DNA sequence: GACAGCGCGTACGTGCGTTTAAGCGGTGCTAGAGCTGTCTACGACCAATTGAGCGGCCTCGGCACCGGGATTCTCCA
DNA sequence: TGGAGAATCCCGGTGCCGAGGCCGCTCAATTGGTCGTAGACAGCTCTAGCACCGCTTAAACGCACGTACGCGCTGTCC
């Protein structure tokens, strides 16, 4: 068994040079679907839109997660609690 | 009689014609100088070449010959001044740049 | 239909620069966006330039004004050059 | 003539998507409290585009989304992307 | 003795207006591959 | 010459809610700022949404889409109201 | 025939021949429709009715006749719609909104 | 026995009584010595507006402004009460000035 | 004639002013100079393209309107100075 | 008040079989993506008039101020 | 826990020029024309968006557990 933790830098690297998309294309289109009913009945949708929307997403999150971190680094801590994201988009301005 | 693009009067690489449709269309003033858009591709093309430059060196470093998006990242976020210009900029499937705050690494 | 784009102008150069490169479809779209991007950015800047001093007319100087606005220090000094070149280039000839 | 009514697929943002998205972002250790938050945040940026989506698909008095709705949307709020035409 | 530093002075010459203009070419400390850029641009 | 700004309409609008108010100049200059760059905005963005659908002509339809663009919720419901009213108005003048 | 303005016809303040004139020399679009200008002034008029009301209450609020900025400042600040409207937006003289957080305060 | 205020109370003092004053907390000249100091570099002999000089200061103080509640911010949730510089160059960097 | 060195113009009781005003209550020794160089690049900033205004323009005379001009371009609109 | 020391107890990371549901073509299928003639009606432009806006000039009235009692935070007790 | 001292607070005079009206006067807002084109629009076509089907496999789940992280507090010193 490994020590906790390598394996996570094992997979930080995996995926910091790696650059396909994160996310089950099927639930990201569900759960669009689903938020879109809220404003207009029955609307069609270009996949490519979809797909351009998922990724717009994960680049908003992904930042986020940076910003969170450093947050907490600050916070001499390596576990991210809500507080920090919190206070992050306080910072930005989205709260 | 013999046409002779206003680009290759600049020894240009971008039709300037084109251009100065574009502009002539794009509702920013009623009238347009000449010389603009001369300038306006030469810049234009300068650009141009600082990133794709950049870009082949990339897919060189990673033994590639065509260029792929992920080189696009790279080439953007590991400059200062193409990165300040790009700060609000996505870019699809392109990642980000591999870095390791130093606090989390083993030791 | 008769859909536009400047692919082949990037083709081009990126055969004057790396001449024996690839290039992604995608990657080339992606050209194609920051070109524009670029175009409309200076263009806005440059006839707000024109309102300001109540002209008429977007000439050489305003488009080098943008320039310096837009881009910053070193970039600007060589597009600065490069356009002074151009421009010279083309009313000399 | 099929139009149902969705519920829920939120949780179908699986945990270990998420885990994946922070391990991209370099993160080391992670609340289980975090998890929702993401959830609704990541909710409140979805809506917050969306709208503006529609509001380009119904001025165009059009029923379907194009992709270039989503980046006027986006170039809106500043949060250009290259690579779909626009 | 004279004829002899005038040789010498001529020698200078070159290296110390070399300098001269290097100087007003490269007074500031400035990332001058993009000064080379220009050169391989053209 | 002539200097032109909004401050008569801001003070009679003023009297319609507030008849026994008074004011600073210098939040005059901040209300005449306000119109200013509210008016510049908004036109800029439908301006845009003409561009988006390749037209020539001005019309409310994207100032309605633009207002519901920039004003949110609450904000946009009163004001795409008060704006149907008047151009009803107008028009069944 | 005497002449009626726009304005009055919509039973407006502002004044639609100033904005259309506005419009149509600000190079947006290259035409424009008739009920556009009254569409956006009627929207101008409400938002500033909204303002106004807004700080006169604001003065009210410390026995005062005029308005100031600083009225403008804290009204604007203490409305969640209008202060995101004027979120990047900083006013002249305005101040801040007297705000101490929980744990700066002795216990 | 010589009356002295705790360490703090006195802070909350002029908290208050700058939260609700409206006006400037710099000095003028040396302000607008620093806009020429500065305005000197890029061009030789430039005359200026007092306008000018004060739209330069409102624009700064708001700046700063925003900028220390946000450093505060920092420092609360790092559990402390005093401010020290990593938590400006840490909002810094979070609102994306580079 | 030559200027310099009025960054030290910005006293330290200027400092924990705008401080105070923002709601802090303790300061470190090393912030005033943290303070001086962040407002210098800010002021650099906007002077510059102030600046830039000023000569498209063709005056010798930097205006309001041209520093208004730049401080709205960065994110920071002034209202108040037409 | 900041900072570090230390111990401790808990909520978090790694394996690990175990489902399970996303994905993947394969197949229909209809709805609206994507067009093109065609014909007005509405603004673009221009031409008589004019009225409202803007600027200059009084004028008085909120309002900052002053200072003196009058009324509360603070800090040991 | 109660007072002493400091800090605020308030209010009625006390100055004072900035809103606040106000008014000649000139130009932009309004008005009636023409005119040509843009855009309305239905049709026509037709494209892409959707629904549906086994079925397999890769990816999510459950859970234990153990393991190291968070956290509390306290002297101490600057």
Redesign the interface.
Same mark, same amino acid.
């Given at each position: 068994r490994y020590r906790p933790?390598?394996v996570?830098?094992r997979? +930080?690297?995996?995926?910091?040079?790696?650059?396909?998309?994160?996310?089950?294309k099927?639930?990201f289109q569900?759960?669009?679907?689903? +938020?879109?009913?809220?404003?207009?009945?029955?609307?069609?949708?270009?996949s490519?839109?979809v797909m351009?929307?998922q990724?717009?997403?994960? $680049?908003?999150?992904?930042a986020?997660?940076?910003?969170?971190?450093?947050?907490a680094?600050?916070?001499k801590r390596?576990?991210?609690?809500?507080?920090?994201?919190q206070?992050?988009?306080?910072?930005? #301005?989205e709260r | 009689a013999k046409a002779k693009t206003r680009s290759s009067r600049a020894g240009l690489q971008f039709p300037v014609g084109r251009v100065h449709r574009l502009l002539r269309k794009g509702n920013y003033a009623e009238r347009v100088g000449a010389g603009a858009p001369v300038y306006l591709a030469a810049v234009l093309e300068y650009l141009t070449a600082e990133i794709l430059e950049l870009a082949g060196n990339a897919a060189r470093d990673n033994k590639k010959t065509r260029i792929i998006?992920?080189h696009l &990242?790279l080439a953007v976020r590991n400059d200062e001044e193409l990165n300040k210009l790009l700060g609000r900029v996505?870019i699809? &499937?392109?990642?980000?740049?591999?870095? @390791?705050?130093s !606090?989390?690494l083993?030791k | 239909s008769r859909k536009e784009s400047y692919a082949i102008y990037v083709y081009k150069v990126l055969k004057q620069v790396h001449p024996d490169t690839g290039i992604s479809s995608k990657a080339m779209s992606i050209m194609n966006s920051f070109v524009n991007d670029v175009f409309e950015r200076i263009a806005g800047e440059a006839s707000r330039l024109a309102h300001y001093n109540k002209r008429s007319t977007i000439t050489s100087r305003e488009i080098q004004t943008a320039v310096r606005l837009l881009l910053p220090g070193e970039l600007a000094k060589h597009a600065v050059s490069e356009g002074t070149k151009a421009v010279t280039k083309y009313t000399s000839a | 003539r099929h139009?149902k009514?969705?519920?829920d697929? @939120?949780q179908? @943002?699986?945990k270990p998507?998420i885990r994946?998205?922070?391990?991209?972002? #370099?993160?080391?250790?992670?609340?289980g409290? +975090?998890y929702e938050?993401?959830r609704g945040?990541?909710?409140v940026?979805?809506?917050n585009? @969306?709208?503006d989506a529609?509001t380009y698909?119904?001025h165009a008095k059009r029923?379907? !989304?194009? $992709?270039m709705?989503?980046?006027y949307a986006?170039k809106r709020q500043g949060?250009t992307?290259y690579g779909?035409g626009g | 003795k004279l004829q002899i530093l005038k040789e010498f002075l001529s020698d200078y010459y070159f290296i110390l207006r070399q300098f001269e203009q290097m100087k007003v070419q490269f007074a500031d400390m400035k990332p001058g591959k993009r000064q080379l850029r220009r050169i391989q641009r053209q």
């Open positions: 933790g390598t996570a830098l997979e +930080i690297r995996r995926y910091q040079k790696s650059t396909e998309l994160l996310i089950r099927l639930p569900r759960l669009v679907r689903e +938020i879109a009913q809220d404003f207009k009945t029955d609307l069609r949708f270009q490519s839109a351009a929307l990724e717009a997403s994960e $680049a908003y999150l992904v986020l997660f940076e910003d969170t971190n450093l947050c680094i600050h916070a390596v576990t991210i609690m809500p507080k920090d994201i206070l992050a988009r306080r910072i930005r #301005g | 998006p992920r &990242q996505t699809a &499937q392109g990642g980000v740049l591999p870095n @390791i705050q !606090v989390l083993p | - | 139009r009514v969705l519920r697929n @939120i179908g @943002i699986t998507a994946r998205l922070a391990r991209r972002g #370099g993160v080391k250790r992670i609340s409290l +975090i938050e993401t945040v990541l909710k940026f979805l809506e585009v @969306i709208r529609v698909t119904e029923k379907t !989304v194009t $992709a709705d989503v980046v986006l949060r992307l779909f | -």
